[PDB]
C-alpha cells in the first residue's frame, strides 16, 4: 500500500511487496514442468502465442552442454539470467577445466537476484526458472524464484495452473524417479504431468516444448515435428 513504492522498503509485517509483485508476474506466465530420474532430467514447457498469426514464445534456453533452464514470466529477464549462467558455466570451464555444478549454478543465481532486492533504483527480476542438469553427482532439478530462493527438487512446476502438474508429480514421485536409462518414458511422464495444467487447450505440434539432459545425453531441445511422438 504505502510500502510497495520500491524494493528497498519493508512493510510493517516484514514483507517486500515489489518482490511479491515480481512473483505475481510468474503466476501469469505459461506453465512449465521439470522432473528427473537418477540418469536423466527433463524440462517440459507449454509455449504461448499472441494469436494464430504469431509464433509461440520459446520457453527453454541452453546454458551449457550439460545444463539449461525453462522460463516463466518476463522473458527478457530470463535472457539476462541465462546469459549470466552461460558465462559462469563458461568461466568454470576456461579457468578450472571443470563443468559447473548445478548446485553452484543455483547459488550464483540466488546471489544475483538478491542484490536487486536490497538496493535503491533497481528492481527484482520478474521471472521464475527451472534449471536442469547432469554433473559429477548425477541428475539435478532446481527451482529459481526472483526473491532469491533456489530449491533442489525431484520434480516441480511453475506458471499458471502449475498446481495441477505439481500435485500429479507428488503422486507419481515413486514411479518416475526410477525411470533410469529410458529417455522417452521420462518425457512421457513429464508430458502427462503438464497435461494436468491444461484448460480448454490441448498439446499440439507447435505448442509443446521439451528438453532433456542425462548421462550420455547433452542438453538438447525438441520443437516442431520432433515432439509429435509424445502427443
Amino acid at each position: 500500500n504505502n510500502y510497495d513504492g520500491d524494493t528497498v522498503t519493508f512493510s510493517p509485517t516484514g514483507r517486500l511487496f515489489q518482490v511479491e509483485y515480481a512473483l505475481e508476474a510468474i503466476k501469469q506466465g505459461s506453465v512449465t514442468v521439470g522432473l528427473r530420474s537418477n540418469t536423466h532430467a527433463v524440462l517440459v514447457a507449454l509455449k504461448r502465442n499472441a494469436d494464430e498469426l504469431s509464433s509461440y514464445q520459446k520457453k527453454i534456453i541452453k546454458c551449457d552442454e550439460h545444463m539449461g533452464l525453462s522460463l516463466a514470466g518476463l522473458a527478457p529477464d530470463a535472457r539476462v539470467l541465462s546469459n549470466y549462467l552461460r558465462q559462469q558455466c563458461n568461466y568454470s570451464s576456461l579457468v578450472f577445466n571443470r563443468k559447473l555444478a548445478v548446485e553452484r549454478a543455483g547459488h550464483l543465481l540466488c546471489d544475483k537476484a538478491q542484490k536487486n532486492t536490497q538496493s535503491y533504483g533497481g528492481r527484482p527480476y520478474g521471472v521464475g526458472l527451472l534449471i536442469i542438469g547432469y554433473d559429477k553427482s548425477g541428475a539435478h532439478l532446481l527451482e529459481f524464484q526472483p526473491s532469491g530462493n533456489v530449491t533442489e527438487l525431484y520434480g516441480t512446476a511453475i506458471g499458471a495452473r502449475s498446481q495441477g502438474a505439481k500435485t500429479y508429480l507428488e503422486r507419481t514421485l515413486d514411479t518416475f524417479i526410477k525411470i533410469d536409462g529410458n529417455p522417452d518414458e521420462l518425457i512421457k511422464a513429464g508430458v502427462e504431468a503438464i497435461s494436468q495444467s491444461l484448460r480448454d487447450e490441448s498439446l499440439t505440434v507447435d505448442n509443446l516444448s521439451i528438453a532433456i539432459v542425462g548421462k550420455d545425453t547433452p542438453f538438447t531441445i525438441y520443437d516442431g515435428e520432433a515432439v509429435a511422438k509424445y502427443i
Partner: protein, 235 residues
C-alpha cells in the same frame, strides 16, 4: 512520485505498460510474410496539408536483407535503427556474412529494458522488422518496448491494429503470392485509415531474396491502389 522500474501489483512494469498506450496512439503499420517475400506498409498521416508527405520516413532500411516499419513516438526509433544498422554491419565485419533476422531483432530488443535510475524511460515506439536469411527464410518480427519479440505471419500495429489484426486473421494463408500480399496491405490500410488512402498518405515496401529491401515509389503504389479498387468492384 514513484520509481521508473517499479512493478504494479499485477506484476507488470508501469512504464512499459504506459509506453504501450503511446504506441496505440501512433499511425498504423502492417506487415505480411509470404514464401515470395515480406511486405511492409504504413499510414503516413500528415498533420497538415502543407507538410510534404514524402519526407515522412516511417519505413526504413537496416541492411540489404532487413527492413523496418515503425509506429508510435517515431523520434524514439532513430537510435533503435542506428543500433540495428551498426549491429548488422558489425556482424558482417566480424563474420563475413549476412546476420540472421532473429539475431538482429534480439539485438534491438536488448536496448528495450536498458532504462531506469542507461536511458531514463522505455521507448515509445513499436517496430515491425522484416527480412530474409538462408536458414529461416522470409520472416516478420514485432519488437516491443518490453524487450519481447514475436515472429508473425502477419501483423498490424498502431491505432487501427486490433481491427486490422482481426482482418489479417481471416485473409492470411500459407500460399499467398507477393502481389496478393501487396493488395492485402493496401486493402486493410484503407479500411482502418481516417483519411482516404492514396499514394501520398500511404507507403509500401518489401524485401525479397533476389532484389533485397525496396521502398516502393509513389507511381508504383498508385497502380497497386488502382488495381485494388478494380478487383473489389469486380464481384
Amino acid at each position: 512520485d514513484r520509481g521508473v522500474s517499479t512493478f504494479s501489483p499485477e506484476g507488470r512494469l508501469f512504464q512499459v505498460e504506459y509506453s504501450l498506450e503511446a504506441i496505440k496512439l501512433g499511425s498504423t503499420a502492417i506487415g505480411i510474410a509470404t514464401k515470395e517475400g515480406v511486405v511492409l506498409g504504413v499510414e503516413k498521416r500528415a498533420t497538415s496539408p502543407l507538410l510534404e508527405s514524402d519526407s515522412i520516413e516511417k519505413i526504413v532500411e537496416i541492411d540489404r536483407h532487413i527492413g523496418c516499419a515503425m509506429s508510435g513516438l517515431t523520434a524514439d526509433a532513430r537510435s533503435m535503427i542506428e543500433h540495428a544498422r551498426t549491429a548488422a554491419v558489425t556482424h558482417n565485419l566480424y563474420y563475413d556474412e549476412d546476420i540472421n533476422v532473429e539475431s538482429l531483432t534480439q539485438s534491438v530488443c536488448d536496448l528495450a529494458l536498458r532504462f531506469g535510475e542507461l536511458m531514463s524511460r522505455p521507448f515509445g515506439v513499436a517496430l515491425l522488422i522484416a527480412g530474409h536469411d538462408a536458414d529461416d527464410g522470409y520472416q516478420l518480427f514485432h519488437a516491443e518496448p518490453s524487450g519481447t519479440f514475436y515472429r508473425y505471419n502477419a501483423k498490424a500495429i498502431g491505432s487501427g491494429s486490433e481491427g486490422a489484426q482481426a482482418e489479417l486473421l481471416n485473409e492470411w494463408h500459407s500460399s499467398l503470392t507477393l502481389k496478393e500480399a501487396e493488395l492485402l496491405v493496401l486493402k486493410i490500410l484503407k479500411q482502418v485509415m481516417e483519411e482516404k488512402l492514396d499514394e501520398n498518405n500511404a507507403q509500401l515496401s518489401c524485401i525479397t531474396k533476389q532484389d533485397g529491401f525496396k521502398i516502393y515509389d509513389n507511381e508504383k503504389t498508385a497502380e497497386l491502389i488502382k488495381e485494388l479498387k478494380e478487383k473489389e468492384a469486380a464481384e
